[PDB]
């Protein structure tokens, strides 16, 4: 009788236990203490209750789903995926997750402690899939929420190396769904061709979702893969920290981004990226504005390390028929970024910041402002013509650069005869240090190439830290660019031998509220009078100049040109020098030309 | 016989076990392996040893205390609070913690792994309480220490929604006490009206205490609550990182602060705050100086995201009869902060930095210096008159601003006819970017309103980035403010149409070691002489000016005014221009006035 | 029969269990569920299988090694070191780790969850040791890898207080070896005299190794200890975050460093250091370049708090017969550092950044560039003569300072008649704020002491924020230092009473591509002519000056000196002033001297 009970599945419920033989402890049964934990092994059995060993020819999916469903029924808990085993998944899930090509359905309060390895079987080759899905409905708009679901451990999700079957397919590791207080910590995602590794939230619905101390390795492998973003953050008060992202595929240099920050109060910090095209998008899509409003604000990209091939941070916002997206209150700081070794134009245009047109190419829908870029480093190798501190390709309502170090081909750039952005409140502080890696490479090129429709309320304070006489100019405005209510200065250091410093092809520096200064060489002639004597410019190009001063020594004994000049209505400069002995003087002098500064 | 033993509480101590049938493993009994872990279930029993189910009508407090006391007796360990259950607490603790309105007494080396939910029963409604207390005595001065106590897990402490009964009451979640190597990680504290969620240390006694990845949600709910600070850090080598703080109550906008950093080598990093009045205090209270000395130094507030209604960082120090507190070596960097949408003056004055008078209102007791504020963003909506980069309300011995972006009503402010602080070593670097949100709102107002007793060894380098002709002046010193050994500059950009740029109501810019420059409009008249000819100012207000130069074009052909001016003893400016044709000239010119720069 | 089986070591394999009595769960045996975890207790037994109690007189080493070896055999897992016990280690390991004075050999996929205490027995007194070793061979070049090995928990590794027996000995806590995806989290290392606490990687071989939330306390205690670096990072894509490091020994002030970052893509963040000589080395040793190439790049030191006695960050690179090491793409940001209270010259020279010669003292082997130092604070007490923002002691190919706050004796320093470094691309932006703690201490001293062989492509923009008339000069170049293609400026603020501002002992400011400006006092005499009249310098020292302007008021009525000057071939300055009444004038005026700026 008793032997039978003991050898039965209830035997453990008949063996008494009391913790450490403490007389004041609960008199329990072994089964009670065992019931305090739960593993996959508890559900990984055949219809007769016999345990089944996982392996390449066993599909563990129904067993893991049964575990999650059961623990869900009790109010939650943590299911362990045991170490020292690989658990293969080999069929699709059913019900609500079928619309998402779901394998496993996550449930609220049911955490997974993944210590072993989860692998995809070749059933998934050339097919879409999303491994873990928190939606409970095919239609995300009619889905319930996922709350308090955490995935963590020292384990591994391995996507089996399979290529995409078709570019239109989607593949994901974890889709938390309409996700509140959910996280992934510690896990290695590897060996795939996927669209995302993790997505958080759904069109603004969700909160407090995080990815921390995870690794993402080799998650693009084919030319079929349309696009890849390793973590898409689509709910507020969420972010990514202390993660490692690496790709080795060539295709990843053209298509892969590490992070999308698409809702307010989101962050990307303390991570290391290598082998990717892009670092992060910081974006408000109107099409995603349902759950948390139409503004992306409080967006933070900080203290990351990257080697990328395209753009580090891309800013944007866009509209739909009924919603307009807005982006503001952004900080990009402390990141050290480089474009990896590559040929010029062999990948998307290299940039630290990109102001990106929308997915249909429009550049007149964006509302981006109050962005602070500060205390970052950027480097691109000397050969990479297509490298810029900022590629400013769509309308910009403000962006502030302070105390960065940029060492690349262009500081500000936009391609001519593409978009003509409207620019407001572009602020480039004199504390931005311009590196010299690209010195001597800039023939035909303008360091600050202002290829815009208009610039207003902007500040460009150019300071070189070494010579580059190859460059056509430090800063150039084409005649088509309006310029008003702006400050544009070129410091003289390392400019003495430059023919052109600042160029205003439409003579826009004449505007009533344009404040500029830059070096120029000017020819002057004096009157013949002995004593105090006026010197006048030969050219009549200076009706806009409020004052000028000498940047050249005077090699003469018998006279000196004026130290300082003002102008005359006919556009000459004029100053008062000194003839110790009389005679008409003729000199060529390097001047600092100033207007309202 | 054997059946009896097996069904007894010692039955598990009679069932042999050897790990994985390994012949070299220990021959143990099931009870030994079970004894490797411990849960609340092991103590949650009646006097007969029968397990009791937790619930709203069961008080789990004595059972949890018995578990902690027992594990403490064995040298420590980790007690799990099981998932899928809510454990209610419904009575006060006894002994040493009674003086602290304690519920549970923490003990050294006994960690709590909280995976379920701990809730307060309505016994606590309208009463004080501190849920977990690490002091062992009613009098903190006679308390022993708490060491090596960690609280962690995916669980929840829920304060039951109860309001305070009286403003003088105190309520806390975790009071570690005189706490060494203690931490809270992962836990959600929610649904209360409390004074603090967590306190670390006691008046400088403690070390290596941290709060990490915790959430604090809705912990103020009534007008009775006197004050709320979510984490009070009162021991050195301690801090808060990667936490989330949110309030929805109106009252929280007026009374709630996220963090107090009150001892040296403490930090607040990588967190997100919404709905609070204040971000952090960085303070040395003399009354708290017993355990770690009288200096708060090495204080770090970094990489946080906040939407607040009052002040982001408040600095201070104060004194007692016998102790003087000092604050120095502070860094505030990388934070992106905004004042949330509100009416002007509807909450405490909005500020990025506040120099706060002591709790009795004194402004002449503080010793604050060597503070660095760098690479932060601040924004306040255009309507919020009461918004400042720094509200400088008490004596300041130094604070350095570099490469911040401030977009609010005032840069520097103090209210006139309140405190008259004594200011030393206020440094505002030209790399601080002043935003334009408040342009056109500043009628009657000074952007830098220097409402102080005295300013010395200070630097204010004003740089606008857009026009605001509504403002009375960029910077103004009342006659009551002494000014010496200081540098005060206003860059000309966007100032051409300003009637007043810098204003010294006591003509303080004349001081021997004052170094200033700013734009002014000046009327000048020349002598009638043809040729080189002097121009003189009509007004005699310029005896302090060392040089001036033209910021205006010359619309004339027949003459030019001087490019550069110096002065004369009677206070006129004078320069040498050029009359091509003779005649008395009269012109109004915008000049850069300079003094010793 | 059945009684015998049940009391046997297989008894638990005969007691059936099914999780929570769920009919769809696996019918298992108690032994199966127990086998899901493993502890030291499972191996801590005598030859008869009887458990042995750990203690000061028991050597736990063979038992722990047996556990690791066994778990390794099953594909890995996590062995717990139980809480509430101290486990002593009292003999050396055997085999592959014997060459490393190894105690325990780590194995791939076998994690240690250390919750108790591991202590060293006095067998190790005066001997070398490395507690945990991941190499499997005496010769690291012939060692296999360690992968997926994590050490974590709330436990403690205690080195027993024993002193080193001889300086040439080595002692370590954890040597992961050729280590891929390995980490230490949560652990306290204490009470030793050791060389390192943790090393990661081996000469570039390894990846994704981290130390997080660990504490290192009192790990130097004797004068025998040659050198100490708490964490040596010798593999890429690895780092240290949120750690606490403290020393109390005097010897630690002279010999101890917290971190070595010696391979690319490595970081040191969010940590607190006290009592150490140095913060971090960022170094490419040619001798260590085998596994990850010859370049250290993407090196990040950020958001740390330190009180040190020598240098905070030391940069270097060096060569071997066949390999040349290079260092580039470094960021040092957000750190708040101070030199602790000490006598001048009582420890290694105090510095925020050191450019360190190699271990044989060579200063002409280094290739260091593209370094960004930004948004840091540094303080040293007024008495510490040996304190510098940068001690630039070996060849430097570039380093950029922006928006730091440095408050110490020197800004730039190198000792004369030591090394004569070759300097390129030293950039000190005007946004670096120079503190006043050392005002009045600088007799005989130059704030920027340019004791170099040559300086090129460099920028020094000096800005004072208070007076220090004790200093000999703001910046001084000895005649032996060449200077070309550089910008050197001293802002006038707080300089009016300085006899020397910038000093060029070799008249190097005359160079064709040197761009300089600084204040000087000049004596001038005019001609006697009434009206517009020239003033000329008495001295002929100004042939290099392109323009000068007045920094002094004019106390005269009857005349004014020129506002602005240029020069003449004989080296005089000349300008045009105004005599209202005739007469030879003689004045002494403070001028801003400018050259090509
Ligand atoms: C790979 C990636 O992330 N790319 C970024 C762009 O994302 C956009 O394209 C993606 C391509 O894969 C996604 O669209 C695709 O997936 C959609 C969502 O799938 C459906 O809904 C899921 C919830 C279900 O599980 C699925 O079964 C499926 O039903 C699908 O509707 C599209 O048809 C398909 O092409 C991506 O869509 C978002 O995905 C997230 C995460 O899964 C999800 O939370 C969202 O709900 C979903 N959004 C929308 C609108 O559906 C889609 O956004 C991204 O647009 C771009 C940003 O840069 C551009 O835009 C900037 C702003 O104008 C501009 O500054 C910049 O210059 C532009 O380049 O960045 C990546 O390219
Ligand atoms: C809510 C909050 O934190 N407010 C900050 C101010 O704190 C000060 O007021 C608090 C109001 O709750 C606390 O005082 C209250 O509690 C005291 C401590 O309780 C006793 O001791 C405990 C150890 C026991 O468990 C309790 O049972 C009880 O016996 C009590 O003595 C007071 O009477 C009561 O009002 C707070 O007190 C500190 O609390 C911490 C954490 O519990 C504890 O470690 C300390 O020991 C205790 N300190 C003292 C001195 O007792 C008390 O400090 C805080 O002052 C303010 C800082 O800003 C102001 O001061 C700046 C410096 O001059 C100035 O720059 C600024 O402008 C000022 O506004 O910030 C919050 O307001
Ligand atoms: C304490 C410390 O870390 N000091 C830093 C300097 O490190 C150099 O000296 C150390 C002194 O302990 C180490 O050398 C010692 O150990 C060597 C390694 O031990 C062998 O190999 C191990 C793998 C085995 O387990 C051991 O059993 C043993 O066989 C040994 O070869 C030496 O003979 C001995 O003195 C340190 O050596 C490195 O150690 C790490 C971690 O263990 C290991 O991964 C490496 O493989 C090993 N490297 C080498 C080359 O062997 C050795 O590097 C460090 O040099 C210094 C940097 O600053 C100087 O150099 C800069 C660049 O030129 C210059 O800018 C600066 O001014 C200089 O001061 O910083 C610390 O001093
Ligand atoms: Na779908
Ligand atoms: Na901005
Ligand atoms: Na246009
Ligand atoms: Na009390
Ligand atoms: Na400071
Ligand atoms: Na006064
Ligand atoms: Na060795
Ligand atoms: Na640099
Ligand atoms: Na030389």
From TrEMBL, chains A, B, C:
Provide the residue positions that the database annotates as binding Ca(2+). Answer: 99
Q: Name one GO biological process term.
A: symbiont entry into host cell via disruption of host cell envelope
Q: Which keywords, in A-to-Z order, does the entry hold?
A: Calcium, Degradation of host cell envelope components during virus entry, Degradation of host lipopolysaccharides during virus entry, Glycosidase, Host-virus interaction, Hydrolase, Metal-binding, Viral attachment to host cell, Viral tail fiber protein, Viral tail protein, Virion, Virus entry into host cell
List where in the cell it is found. Answer: Virion
Q: Where is the signal peptide?
A: none
An example molecular function term from Gene Ontology annotations: endo-1,3-alpha-L-rhamnosidase activity
Its domain of life reads Viruses
Is S-adenosyl-L-methionine there in the keyword field?
no
Annotated GO CC locations: virus tail, fiber
Task: Give the UniProt family note.
Answer: Belongs to the P22likevirus tail fiber protein family.
This one is known as Tail spike protein
Q: Which organism is it from?
A: Enterobacteria phage HK620 (Bacteriophage HK620)
In the UniProt record, the gene name given for this protein reads 9
Q: Which residues of the full protein are shown?
A: 114 to 710 of 710
């Amino acid at each position: 009788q008793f032997r039978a009970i003991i050898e039965s599945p209830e035997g453990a419920g008949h063996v008494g236990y009391q913790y450490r033989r403490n007389t004041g402890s609960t008199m329990r049964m072994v089964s009670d203490v065992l019931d305090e934990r739960v593993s996959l092994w508890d559900f990984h059995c055949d219809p007769s209750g016999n345990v089944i060993q996982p392996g390449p020819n066993v599909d563990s999916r129904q067993y893991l789903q049964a575990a999650i469903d059961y623990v869900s029924s009790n109010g939650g808990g943590t299911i362990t995926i045991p170490a020292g085993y690989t658990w293969y998944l080999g069929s699709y899930g059913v019900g609500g997750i079928a619309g998402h090509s779901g394998i496993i359905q996550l449930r609220s309060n049911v955490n997974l402690n993944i210590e072993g390895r989860i692998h995809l079987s070749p059933f998934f080759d050339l097919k879409p899939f999303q491994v873990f899905v928190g939606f409970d409905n095919g239609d995300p708009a009619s889905s319930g929420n996922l709350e308090n679901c955490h995935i963590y451990g020292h384990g591994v999700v391995d996507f089996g190396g399979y290529e995409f079957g078709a570019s239109s397919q989607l593949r994901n590791g974890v889709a938390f769904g309409r996700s509140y207080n959910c996280s992934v910590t510690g896990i290695t995602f590897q060996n795939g061709d996927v669209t995302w590794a993790i997505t958080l939230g759904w069109n603004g619905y969700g909160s407090n979702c995080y990815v921390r101390k995870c690794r993402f390795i080799n998650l693009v492998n084919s030319s079929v893969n349309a696009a890849h973003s390793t973590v898409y953050v689509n709910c507020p008060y969420s972010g990514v920290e202390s993660c490692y992202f690496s790709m080795s595929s060539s295709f990843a240099r053209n298509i892969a981004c590490s992070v999308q920050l698409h809702q307010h109060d989101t962050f990307y910090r303390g991570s290391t990226v290598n082998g990717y095209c892009r670092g992060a998008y910081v974006v408000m899509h109107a099409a995603e504005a349902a759950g948390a409003g139409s503004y992306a604000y409080n967006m933070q990209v900080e203290n990351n390390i990257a080697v990328i091939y395209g753009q580090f941070v891309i800013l944007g916002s866009d509209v739909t028929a009924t919603v307009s997206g807005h982006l503001n209150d952004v900080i990009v700081s402390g990141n050290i970024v480089s474009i990896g070794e590559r040929a010029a134009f062999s990948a998307p245009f290299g940039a630290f910041i990109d102001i990106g047109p929308d997915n249909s190419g429009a550049s007149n829908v964006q509302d981006i402002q109050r962005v602070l870029v500060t205390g970052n480093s950027f480097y691109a190798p000397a050969n990479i013509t297509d490298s810029a501190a900022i590629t400013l390709r769509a309308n910009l309502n403000g962006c502030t650069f302070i105390a960065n170090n940029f060492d690349c081909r262009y500081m500000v750039y936009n391609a001519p005869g593409t978009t003509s952005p409207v620019v407001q409140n572009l602020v480039w502080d004199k504390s931005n240090v311009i590196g010299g890696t690209h010195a001597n490479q800039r023939a035909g090129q303008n360091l600050f190439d202002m290829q815009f429709a208009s610039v207003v309320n902007s500040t460009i304070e150019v300071q070189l830290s070494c010579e580059d006489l190859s460059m056509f100019s430090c800063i150039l405005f084409p005649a088509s660019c309006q310029l008003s209510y702006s400050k544009i200065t070129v410091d003289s250091a390392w400019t003495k031998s430059m023919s052109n410093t600042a160029v205003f092809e439409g003579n826009q520096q004449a505007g009533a509220n344009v404040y500029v200064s830059y070096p120029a060489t000017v020819n002057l002639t004096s009157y013949n009078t002995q004593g105090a004597v006026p010197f006048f410019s030969t050219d009549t190009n200076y009706a806009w100049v409020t004052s000028a001063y000498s940047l050249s020594i005077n090699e003469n004994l018998d006279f000196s040109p004026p130290a300082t000049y003002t102008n005359k209505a006919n556009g000459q400069l004029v100053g008062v020098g000194y003839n110790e002995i009389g005679g008409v003087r003729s000199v060529s002098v390097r001047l600092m030309l100033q207007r309202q500064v």
